[PDB]
Design a protein around this ligand. Structure first.
Ligand SMILES: N#C[C@H](Nc1ccc2c(c1)CNC2)c1cc(Cl)cc2[nH]ncc12
Lengths: 39, 155
């Protein structure tokens, strides 16, 4: 049986760790909700 | 507990307590990704949360009521992933999203790497509004993970 526990508030944190890139990807979404890459 | 906020989705079916995902509680409705619960009922203390709406293709599901989250990424600004990783504290990670180009349109995408149990972690705009959930995407050449900014529709 699944259960939930509170983990925090939903707020924007000013001066948070800024990381990650911004890729432009050609994707496809199938009937099962799974993404795949095209070329 | 029906307090607004971010919640861990746990199971006791496996060894010890295992985190399968995360979700958002907003306006009395619990929102998560379909692949986390598979549409099964959830427990919150003594209370029961029954599914209300779900869709395998969108990979979303709402408990106690219709989907409430309708804010959208503006296509220009940086956003925050409120990552809630298994066994670790909630943590805001600011990033500028990329794009998933599809035959049905472009969708925002966050290029951040987290365990599969982080699925359902909300993505927020500068006002703290939930613009979507993290946990449905693709694995690129690099071996890294890139998730869509998956948002539902509010009726
Ligand atoms: N767990 C899980 C996630 N994938 C998933 C798994 C099953 C389905 C979908 C997405 C939609 N259709 C069914 C997932 C989430 C994160 Cl945060 C990272 C990850 N890396 N590899 C899978 C992975």
């Amino acid at each position: 049986d699944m259960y939930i526990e509170r983990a925090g508030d939903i707020t924007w944190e000013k001066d948070a760790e800024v990381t990650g890139n911004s890729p432009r990807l050609d994707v496809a979404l199938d009937e099962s909700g799974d993404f795949s890459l095209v070329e | 507990e029906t307090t607004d906020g971010v919640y861990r989705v746990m199971t006791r079916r496996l060894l010890g307590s295992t985190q399968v995902g995360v979700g958002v509680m907003q306006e009395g409705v619990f929102h998560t990704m379909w692949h986390v619960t598979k549409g099964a009922a959830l427990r919150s203390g003594e209370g029961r949360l029954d599914p209300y709406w779900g869709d395998v293709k969108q990979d979303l599901v709402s408990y106690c009521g219709p989907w409430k989250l309708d804010a959208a990424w503006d296509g220009l600004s940086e956003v925050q992933l409120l990552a809630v990783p298994p066994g670790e504290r909630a943590k805001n990670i600011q990033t500028l999203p990329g794009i998933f180009k599809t035959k049905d349109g472009d969708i925002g995408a966050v290029a951040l790497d987290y365990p599969a149990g982080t699925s359902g972690s909300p993505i927020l705009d500068k006002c703290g509004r939930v613009i979507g959930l993290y946990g449905n995407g693709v694995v690129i050449k690099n071996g890294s993970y890139v998730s869509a900014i998956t948002q539902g529709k509010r009726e």
